[PDB]
Write a protein that binds this ligand. Structure first.
Ligand code: SF4
Ligand code: MG
Ligand code: ZN
Ligand code: ZN
Lengths: 189, 422, 370
DNA sequence: ATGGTCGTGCCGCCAATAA
């Protein structure tokens, strides 16, 4: 499920441009039932009357820094020993390879594993894409009446445009650079 | 280039998205499955067979008659689909024959629809080295060919062209003295060339399938392709609703066992005994029990002989049809709690006892259990009060204040649940 | 293999093969820990064809002259008796690739100017971009021929960048930064070559970095504005300029050892090592914070020919020096915190083809502070 | 028409106790 897939993902944090209170974006909407309102509608601070939806520039900018931090962390290349007793962490990649993969230089019988697997990076990117994807957030509702009620009350064409702007900010990174591309030549030849 | 029929060689080199990767496999599986239905329910010559098969080929965007130039997309679709499906149906010997038979049938259909005159270029485009004869040559050898003809009635040498082939490639024909041989060259009617084309395609297809299977461990290393290589053959009381009961009436232990059987297509001995005896308890007989177990084990890519000589004896003995002929009572909940503790690779036992709270919490969560009920169940488990916790689970999933009974047997659980549900 | 053919070495030896007689080893220099490399901790990691990716420590006591950094591919002559340590006897000098061969068409051209500026284009506490403004003014007054602008146009270490206090997206900040130069250099009419830097926060953080994407270019602008990836080798009037935005001097000299320190030129030896390893970034492993994708590193980070002029900005002192018959220019940053930096201007013409072989087309270089 | 100890391949048989 979506909840269990994104459990290990780091939640997106962004200070409010007006009051400075840290906000929480873990899903498109917050709450349940009648009070299921978009997370970008109002600030987390009660006294704050500024709409975070207005500050789309700051949200996208902070998303930019967060994604850059994540991709640099992945390209750092940190490896960890699988053996609980060794726990060897090295930045230099040894050329001594076993059947499973790299061989630890401290202990001679173990396989080094990447600290940040590609699956984790792709899951984090998908979580960032999903938290601002209202198109799939509206079709998830089992009732069309509630979907229309929520669409006509807050999801104005400008609001939908801002949400699509965030989704396209994610999709610029998710579009060409990837992981979902499978080379048939390497698979067969 | 004749993209409407093609001997599948020269594997492609393009790259595609994974969504299209799965869509191509599922579409090819659907088409090849429907070829089975068309070939079984009908006969190979009716117009309805041709109409239905070509309509379905049109529906799934696949190549057909060559009279309309640029259908490059269906060509690419079929080319990628065959090679992507080669990886899956090459594992078990019960699936290789299924693949080959229906692919040969599809190629026969595609061959029968070539209009009349683009066949010659195709024969050269598939590395076959065949030839035709002009009208004067046909008239020169007319009597010789009709004399050399098979039991085909009549001397009338119709408009069907006569093909010229190296003799070694016509082994199935000149062995029976049914063709004409001259200067080391065989002359054949157009009707019989289909047999040799399919026979020569079959050997290459089988060789390609074999050479892919042994170099397929290298491809399992990819973690994104595991679902595809293993789930292309996946998917009073009757068989066609038990899954529903798994969500509705079963206790968490037996529901866990059913989920394990559905997913892993196998179970260890303790789970086998426990689930089988409970499944007898609900009311199944021997025939459908054997049906259920064999259906659940064949999906594990094992042939029926292994199941029949391995597990059928134990399954029959469970009901009391061999040995002393003793019929057994389903396990009491106390022995489930206390006897035969589970280990790694095993899924049997009582979840409320053997499973740690750090896993029992999400076990309750995945079953739409309210957080207050979750906390109460955790408190009861910490107090070693298991039966009342299972009763509370029953009340919460049944939306009643009190169940009205004391639980000591999962069969009692199921009977009480079905008392109100039905 | 290239060094084996150059030095006429008969064959190589595996690292793990013992040998009493002196033997030649092929491998890569590296360190045995995560700390700073020292002469005691130098190890050689062999090739997979010969040594099957083995590693052995080396002893530099019996070596007269050496200069080693991690990631350098050399041929090491020495003794390995016990099979676990190699003692040096002689270290082979790197052989640079031959210079580009000029064509007859390239010798018919006239005087050419190459102005070079490197980021940042603003002071470390303000966003007025005044260094960019007077750089554009200098460009307009100079009337040069080529204008090569390196990053970071939007520095990833500028304090307002990471505090997300701005009111405009860095994507749009890119457009106003572009149109600044675009409408500032229309009267000059000089060609503009914008090369990105790894510190460009708004762009994709991959080394090598793709050329910038920009669509708001008029027909006149497209004839004057050219987008080139980073790094790249661009031929300007028949002269191969090596354009790179990475502080390769700080990449290399910060983690390199040497045998002589009294009278030796540092920047020259790092430049020679860069020119002899036939790659844009020989360093392996790199430092903590810079992302490289190795798949395209083999196909987009090598020397086709030895470039005639190297443009290598650095945080260190500006310097223009002739190493291995090649003029390497380091104008540094245009702005250095709260104190101004430097830019450069170069003359280039093609002299007569005949002569004493080597003849530097770029006779004159001048680095001037903005 | 010497003793015992060890492993490998074929078969059949068993547990269970509410309501
Ligand atoms: S208490 Fe008994 S019936 Fe309930 S889950 Fe545990 S074993 Fe099953
Ligand atoms: Mg068994
Ligand atoms: Zn606020
Ligand atoms: Zn280890």
């Amino acid at each position: 499920t979506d909840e269990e897939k994104y459990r290990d993902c780091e939640r997106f944090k962004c200070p409010c441009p007006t009051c400075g209170t840290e906000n929480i974006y873990d899903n498109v909407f917050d709450g349940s039932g009648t009070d299921m309102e978009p997370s970008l509608y109002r600030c987390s601070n009660i006294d704050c009357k500024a709409s975070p939806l207005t500050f789309t520039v700051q949200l996208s900018n902070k998303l930019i820094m967060d994604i850059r931090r994540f991709i640099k962390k992945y390209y750092d290349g940190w490896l960890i020993c699988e053996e609980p007793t060794c726990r060897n962490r090295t930045r230099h990649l040894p050329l001594q390879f076993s059947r499973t993969g790299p061989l630890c230089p401290a202990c001679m019988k173990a396989t080094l594993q990447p600290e940040y697997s590609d699956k984790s990076l792709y899951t984090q990117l998908c979580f960032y894409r999903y938290i601002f994807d209202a198109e799939c957030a509206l079709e998830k509702l089992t009732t069309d009446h509630e979907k229309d009620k929520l669409k006509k009350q807050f999801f104005t064409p400008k609001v939908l445009q801002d949400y699509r702007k965030l989704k396209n900010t994610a999709e610029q990174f998710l579009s060409r650079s990837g992981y979902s591309e499978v080379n048939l030549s390497k698979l067969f030849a | 280039y004749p993209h409407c029929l093609q001997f599948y060689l020269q594997p492609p080199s393009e790259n595609i998205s994974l969504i299209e990767f799965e869509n191509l496999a599922i579409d090819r599986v659907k088409l090849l499955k429907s070829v089975e239905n068309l070939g079984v329910s009908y006969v190979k010559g009716t117009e309805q067979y041709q109409s239905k098969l070509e309509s379905e080929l049109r529906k799934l965007k696949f190549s057909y008659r060559e009279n309309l130039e640029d259908e490059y997309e269906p060509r690419r679709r079929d080319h990628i689909s065959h090679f992507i499906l080669r990886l899956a149906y090459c594992q078990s010997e019960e699936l290789r024959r299924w693949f080959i038979q229906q692919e040969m049938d599809l190629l026969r259909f595609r061959f029968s629809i070539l209009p009349k005159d683009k066949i010659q270029d195709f024969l050269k485009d598939s590395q076959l080295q065949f030839e035709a004869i002009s009208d004067e040559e046909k008239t020169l050898r007319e009597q010789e060919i009709v004399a050399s003809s098979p039991s085909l009635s009549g001397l009338k040498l119709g408009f069907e062209s006569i093909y010229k082939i190296p003799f070694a490639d016509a082994l199935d024909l000149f062995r029976g003295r049914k063709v004409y041989l001259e200067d080391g060259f065989a002359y054949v009617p157009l009707k019989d060339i289909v047999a040799i084309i399919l026979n020569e395609f079959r050997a290459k297809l089988s060789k390609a399938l074999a050479l892919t299977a042994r170099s397929l461990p290298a491809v399992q290393s990819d973690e994104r392709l595991q679902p595809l290589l293993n789930h292309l053959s996946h998917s009073k009381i009757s068989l066609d609703q038990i899954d529903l009961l798994s969500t509705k009436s079963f206790p968490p232990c037996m529901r866990q066992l059913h989920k394990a059987l559905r997913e892993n297509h196998h179970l260890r001995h303790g789970g086998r005994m426990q689930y089988g005896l409970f499944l007898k308890g609900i009311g199944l007989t021997l025939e459908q029990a054997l049906q259920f177990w064999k259906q659940e084990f064949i999906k594990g890519k094992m042939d029926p002989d292994k199941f029949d000589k391995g597990y059928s004896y134990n399954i029959r003995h469970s009901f009391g049809k061999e040995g002393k002929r003793t019929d057994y009572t389903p396990f009491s909940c106390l022995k489930i709690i206390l006897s035969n503790p589970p280990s790694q690779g095993d899924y049997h036992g009582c979840p409320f006892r053997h499973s740690d709270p750090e896993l029992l919490k999400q076990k309750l969560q995945s079953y739409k259990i309210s957080p207050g009920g979750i906390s109460q169940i955790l408190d009861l488990v910490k107090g070693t009060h298991y039966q009342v916790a299972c009763q509370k689970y029953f009340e919460m999933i049944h939306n009643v204040d009190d169940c009205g009974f004391s639980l000591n047997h999962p069969n009692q659980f199921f009977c009480e649940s079905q008392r109100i549900l039905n | 293999s290239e060094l084996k053919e150059h030095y006429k070495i008969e064959a190589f030896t595996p690292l793990l093969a013992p040998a009493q007689e002196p033997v030649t080893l092929l491998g890569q220099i590296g360190c045995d820990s995560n700390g700073k490399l020292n002469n005691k901790s130098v190890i050689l990691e062999g090739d997979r064809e010969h040594s099957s990716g083995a590693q052995i420590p080396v002893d530099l006591s019996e070596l007269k002259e050496y200069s080693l950094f991690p990631g350098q591919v050399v041929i090491m002559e020495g003794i390995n008796t016990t099979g676990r340590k190699l003692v040096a006897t002689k270290l082979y000098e790197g052989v640079p690739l031959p210079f580009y061969q000029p064509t007859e068409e390239d010798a018919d051209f006239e005087q050419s100017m190459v102005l070079v500026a490197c980021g940042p284009y603003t002071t470390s506490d303000s966003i007025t971009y005044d260094p960019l403004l007077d750089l554009i003014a200098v460009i307009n007054h100079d009337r040069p021929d080529v204008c090569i602008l390196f990053g970071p146009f939007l520095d990833a270490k500028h304090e307002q960048v990471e505090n997300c206090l701005l009111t405009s997206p860095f994507e749009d900040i890119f457009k106003q930064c572009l149109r600044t130069i675009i409408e500032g250099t229309r009267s000059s009419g000089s060609h503009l070559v914008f090369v990105p830097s790894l510190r460009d926060v708004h762009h994709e953080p991959v080394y090598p970095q793709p050329p910038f994407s920009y669509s708001d270019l008029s027909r006149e602008d497209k004839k004057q504005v050219q987008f080139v990836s980073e790094p790249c080798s661009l031929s300007i009037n028949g002269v191969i300029f090596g354009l790179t935005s990475t502080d390769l001097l700080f990449h290399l000299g910060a983690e390199e050892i040497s045998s002589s320190s009294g009278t030796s030129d540092r920047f020259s030896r790092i430049l020679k090592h860069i020119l002899t390893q036939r790659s844009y970034y020989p360093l392996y492993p790199p430092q903590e914070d810079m992302a490289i994708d190795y798949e395209s590193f083999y196909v987009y980070a090598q020397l086709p020919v030895t470039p005639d002029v190297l443009i290598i900005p650095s945080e260190l002192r500006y310097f223009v020096k002739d190493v291995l018959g090649c003029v390497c220019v380091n104008p540094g940053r245009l702005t250095k915190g709260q104190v101004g930096g430097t830019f450069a201007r170069l003359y280039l013409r093609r002299p007569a083809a005949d002569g004493a072989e080597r003849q530097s087309p770029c006779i004159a270089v001048q680095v001037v502070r903005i």
